Design a protein around this nucleic acid. Structure first.
Lengths: 57, 76
RNA sequence: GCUUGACGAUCAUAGAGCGUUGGAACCACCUGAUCCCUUCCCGAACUCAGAAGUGAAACGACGCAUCGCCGAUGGUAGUGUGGGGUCUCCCCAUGUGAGAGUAGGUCAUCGUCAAGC
RNA sequence: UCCUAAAGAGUAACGGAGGAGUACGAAGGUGCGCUCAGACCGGUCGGAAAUCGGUCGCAGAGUAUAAAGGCAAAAGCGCGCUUGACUGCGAGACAGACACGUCGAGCAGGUACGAAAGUAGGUCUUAGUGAUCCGGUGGUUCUGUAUGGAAGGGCCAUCGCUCAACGGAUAAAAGGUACUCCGGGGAUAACAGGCUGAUACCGCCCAAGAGUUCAUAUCGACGGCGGUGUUUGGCACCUCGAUGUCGGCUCAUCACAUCCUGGGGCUGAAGCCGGUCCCAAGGGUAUGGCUGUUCGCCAUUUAAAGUGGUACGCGAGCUGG
RNA sequence: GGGGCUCAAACCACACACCGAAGCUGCGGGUGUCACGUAAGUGACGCGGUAGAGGAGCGUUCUGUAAGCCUGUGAAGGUG
RNA sequence: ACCAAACCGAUGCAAACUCCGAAUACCCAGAAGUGCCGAGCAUGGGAGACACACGGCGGGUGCUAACGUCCGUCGUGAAAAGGGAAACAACCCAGACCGCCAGCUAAGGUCCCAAAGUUGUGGUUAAGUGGUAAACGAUGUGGGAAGGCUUAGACAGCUA
RNA sequence: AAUGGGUCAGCGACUUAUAUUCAGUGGCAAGCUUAACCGUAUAGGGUAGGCGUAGCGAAAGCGAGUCUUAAUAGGGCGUU
């Protein structure tokens, strides 16, 4: 229904594809938390950048 | 006994891949000798260039004996 | 309704290989070239007057599974990303994932159309 | 044209492989006709093989030409017509910095062909090429320096010569400099440093073997694995608004992989001498004849005349062969 | 890296703490953009930077404003 | 007794071999959300650049040598400071608008130099291994599966 | 351990002319603006000229239309 992700690592040396998954998910800097809808087209951006994030649910 | 002198790399290949809308003149496969064959509305130019002769979308079927990889455009 | 025609869907699970046949319809021959012509010389090519003959060869469906051909599952190799290492190479997380090989189907499955029984 | 090239394009190297500077009036269009090569075998001139006659065939043939990719609806030959190897164009694409380049119908001029649906704007495809400016030629309706004309120019078609350093400096283009000059560079060589260690050097591992028997007292072919930075390289990282050679002289300083002296193990070490391997860097470790020499070769010594590093130590210490 | 460390101050696991950046948060600070605000007014996202593009300024000398204004009760200049 | 192409089976290996064949990448269409208020495109004004470096990966070249060199693709430095790697453009963490004698973390660390555990539980290692190294060589020690000889009396030690 | 600078104080490097293009800002507007020169002179006169209002074509030319070909048949450029 709603998931909330936090950005826990940086975007600096990351691939241009992966940081576009994090910007397109609503996130801006470290420890920023957004509330994300749990559509699978939204969840795929959570999975392509799984290592940069923390997904509380 | 002396190497050099490669050629200038003719840009062959499947342009306009197999789900795309076409107009009725589009070069559809650049080709070095009909690796792909001519389906319903496509044309087969002189150097074996496939070209759309009608509008629609390109299909890329495999059909028939001899294992022909066809390029046909369906008006959809 | 089946036999068989007539171009086609699908393309070696449909393919090749080893028996029985069909004569009425169809089909190949056959009898011969006179009247069309076919000949790099020829009526076996093919053009035909044909229907005296013939069902083996010719082909056709219709038999029979060795061989080709398809082919799991599971594993393995590879590999995108992230992180390691003893870093010309591999491992870990995660996503994906063959090729080859491993019981065996089968003498295929379809569609319209017609003369005959 | 293939590879490199990482399963879309593209993609470099003085990287690995080959080709082209054309052919074709049929080797094109079309009409028509028509489908390989292979083994298998029949000897009185060919006998591996031809003429090809017919049996199992299972693209392996052929394509004007390199290689790749393609083919039978043949994308090879025969033969007729004898021309679509058409004229005007051209929707739309592909390639693309630009100039270039590549692919592509319908109406007509009009067409070969087929009796016809229809196929044909060259060849199975991709090389077979060259801009502009000047000239040459044939058209033209255009221009035509007062006017009528011509000349010259323009447009359209086509030729040249030669740009192969092949986006082509000019119609026309070789050298020397140790007599040199300037502007720059450590974008770049020589010396030295640095990276690396093929190469050199020194250890080690298996042990065929010789050592008269006996692999290992000594030595070791075939191969193996390392160390040292010790020189021949390789690199071009520092240095070109300067880091001035080789050798001798003078002075050194460190290493130990030890030349002498000191302590030992083993010996194919009787002894005298040695061989070989450990341990050991305290101190010692020539003089001359030749040559610019380092070295080297020689004469005579010595207990011994060691091997390396130090910008191949040392020229604001010397010399200057 | 040094001192120094041997049931470790080493290595292998696991657990829990802590320290550590200009990161992040707290708190105070312009307008950079943008949306709103009949334009007081807050919001939101930013704000490392060479070549380079854009935008905004300060100060000097001269001319007009200036026959003004200041100045010998003290100019410019110099030093605090 | 020599030999003999081809054929049957077993068995390898190719950048210029392929009966096969991915992951990824690329092209396309449709969708939610996010975008700093835009990202994309088009025409104009002004540029600068057209000697890149190193690191990971995928290769050529070399000796699968070089901080060698040539490509592809990333990240960084160029043009990026701060913390870690002792010191160390290019590696790890992270991208500094200004102030604070506030607090949480990242990489990395917690005995002293030096900020934080002489922290807990369980093992290993005696070499200062840690804190440089290869073939190969050794009753160094920890753990684990198995085997043969095993009181009808084994392996090294006594009186036919 | 690449260049330059011993130091101080002065000086020392994107200017000017004429053509032109683009932007901003103005005046006039289907028009706009003058150049030499005249001028009791930054006024006023002077509209020669320049650009704009129409293009297409090599050109004659035709014009909201040519070229081409025997072809008003087929595309490029322009157009309230």
């Amino acid at each position: 229904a709603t998931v909330k992700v936090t950005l826990v690592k940086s975007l600096n040396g990351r691939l241009a594809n992966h940081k576009a998954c994090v910007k397109g998910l609503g996130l801006r800097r470290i420890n920023h938390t957004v509330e994300v809808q749990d559509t699978p087209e939204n969840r795929g951006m959570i999975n392509k950048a799984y290592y940069l994030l923390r997904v509380e649910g | 006994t002396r190497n050099g002198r490669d050629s200038e790399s003719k840009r062959l290949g499947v342009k306009l891949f197999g789900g795309q809308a076409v107009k009725a003149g589009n070069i559809l496969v650049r080709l070095r000798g009909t690796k792909f064959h001519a389906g319903y509305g496509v044309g087969l130019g002189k150097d074996h260039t496939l070209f759309a002769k009608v509008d629609g979308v390109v299909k890329f079927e495999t059909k028939g004996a001899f294992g022909r990889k066809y390029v046909s455009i369906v008006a959809a």
